[PDB]
């Protein structure tokens, strides 16, 4: 994603700093909305 929209304001990629967790494959990126895999998703069942 080269641009992020926050409350109607457009921001270019270069101005922002984004950190992501584990990197999903390209086909799975849209499902995760171009983000890393959350830890809670991987820990909630075992914690319970």
């Amino acid at each position: 994603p080269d641009f992020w929209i926050i409350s109607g304001k457009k921001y270019h990629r270069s101005h922002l700093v984004v950190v992501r967790g584990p990197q999903p494959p390209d086909i799975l990126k849209p499902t995760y909305i171009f983000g890393g895999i959350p830890l809670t998703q991987r820990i909630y069942e075992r914690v319970y």
Binding site: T31, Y32, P38, L39, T40, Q41, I43, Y44, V47
Partner: protein, 49 residues
């Protein structure tokens, strides 16, 4: 395999609201915060040229 594929497909993204709700339990908070608080507590020093 079919059962294996179903088992591996079951895991997936849950949702931001779901993650926020899960994030109230003490165990999850400790697990996600101890490393972060421990990593950057010693500090850093600056070197110029």
């Amino acid at each position: 395999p079919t059962m294996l594929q179903d088992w591996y497909n079951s895991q997936g993204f849950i949702g931001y609201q779901a993650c926020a709700i899960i994030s109230q339990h003490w165990l999850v908070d400790k697990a996600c915060s101890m490393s972060g608080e421990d990593a950057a507590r010693n500090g850093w020093e600056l070197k110029s040229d």
